Write a protein that binds this ligand. Structure first.
Ligand code: NAI
Length: 372
């Protein structure tokens, strides 16, 4: 009877009653209901996004003009689902990361795909650093020892290392990847390596070196490596900070992992499909690497997903730092991307269409950025 805004968020349950700041939940609807109903649209919000095609999300596709998803609990907007939404015009991401859309299928229909770029770049950077510290310093066994009542110092320390004088390398030096490099300077790394299809800005290189000089009296800390297999070969820690597209899917396979040093570390706070998931679990279970991160290949992750029971040979709490996808949905980030979805909808409803250039991933049938 009215044009539909179709929104898929994660459930809040009792959590939403104890925290009004849980804006990114079904119960609170990002606080866009007043704006949506002010423009005569219907707002439908569900956490029921799986399975295809019997979910509430599927059953509201026919009349969906706007679809809002969130990457931490993403309704996968596939070719099949696009074909059932004949009046779809706009897809908004409550957050950053639009891998859960079939962007080429949306381009063939001339669909606009909008993110809130930057709303969690610092939130993810913190999560990557946190994961680096947790793995290198063996917080897993150190925290375990405290919880299970023991005091086996040697069991913790034997796999406990300092961040200092380690080689850190990022695959991707974008907004997030560079912010990790910044937060690594004061930890005094041996070297900071990076890999990107483009150079780091002139002026970004000097900023990092300026902090290395200031904090640690070391110049030339940042350095570009051109061969991916070289970059991982020299690194103690590698961070994935690139988006998921066809050429990057599966890039972290058995061949690349095994070209890293034993006892190295892999951090992936970007997208889970950047790895070969079984190759990661195998290398963790064999002790070749430690792995941590918050992004998974399919979200929600199956309960028998190998990453949930990954652990180095030393024990269950070694080399494992998985969390569910939460880094970009911190309470502070939720306020940012809730407001960014509101800005995007206001521009669309008022037919002004003067979206922030960074927010646009796809528009008028062309990928309007190199952010894939
Ligand atoms: N875990 C979370 O909560 C979130 C995760 N992400 C994910 O991480 C990605 C990082 O994006 P941002 O840094 O925010 O934006 P961005 O605009 O800087 O995009 C990432 C950058 O990485 C580089 N890059 C792209 N493809 C690459 C490849 N195949 N290999 C190496 N480098 C490559 C490019 O410089 C690109 O601009 C997002 O696209 C998203 O998939 C980002 C936001 C939230």
């Amino acid at each position: 009877g009215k044009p539909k805004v179709l929104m898929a968020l994660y459930s809040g349950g009792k959590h939403a009653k104890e925290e009004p700041r849980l804006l990114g939940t079904v119960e609170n609807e990002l606080g866009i209901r007043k704006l949506v109903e002010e423009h005569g649209y219907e707002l439908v919000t569900t956490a029921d996004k799986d399975p295809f095609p019997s979910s509430t999300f599927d059953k509201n596709l026919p009349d969906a003009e706007i679809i809002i998803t969130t990457p931490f609990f993403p309704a996968y907007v596939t070719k099949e689902r696009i074909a059932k939404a004949p009046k779809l015009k706009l897809c908004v991401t409550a957050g950053v990361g639009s891998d859960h859309y079939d962007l080429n299928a949306l381009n063939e229909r001339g669909i606009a795909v909008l993110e809130v770029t930057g709303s969690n770049v610092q939130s993810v950077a913190e999560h990557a650093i946190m994961t680096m510290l947790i793995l290198l310093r063996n917080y897993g066994e150190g925290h375990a020892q405290a919880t299970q009542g023991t005091w086996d110092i040697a069991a913790v320390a034997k796999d406990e290392f300092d961040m200092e004088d380690k080689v850190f390398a990022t695959i991707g030096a974008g907004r997030i990847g560079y912010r990790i490099l910044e937060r690594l300077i004061a930890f005094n790394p041996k070297k900071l390596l990076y890999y990107d299809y483009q150079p780091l800005p002139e002026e970004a290189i000097n900023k990092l070196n300026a902090a290395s000089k200031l904090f640690n009296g070391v110049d030339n800390i940042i350095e570009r490596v051109e061969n991916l297999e070289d970059l991982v070969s020299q690194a103690d820690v590698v961070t994935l900070n690139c988006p998921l597209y066809e050429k990057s899917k599966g890039m972290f396979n058995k061949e690349l992992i095994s070209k890293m040093k034993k006892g190295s570390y892999v951090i992936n706070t970007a997208r889970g499909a950047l790895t070969d998931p079984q190759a990661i679990a195998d290398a963790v279970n064999s002790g070749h690497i430690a792995y941590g991160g918050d992004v998974w290949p399919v979200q929600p992750a199956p309960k028998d997903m190998p990453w949930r029971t990954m652990h180095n040979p030393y024990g269950k709490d070694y080399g494992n730092a998985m969390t569910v996808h939460v880094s970009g949905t911190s309470l502070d980030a939720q306020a940012r991307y809730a407001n960014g979805v509101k800005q995007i909808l206001t521009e669309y409803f008022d037919k002004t269409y003067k979206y922030r250039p960074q927010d646009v991933i796809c528009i008028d049938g062309h990928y309007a950025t190199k952010a894939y």
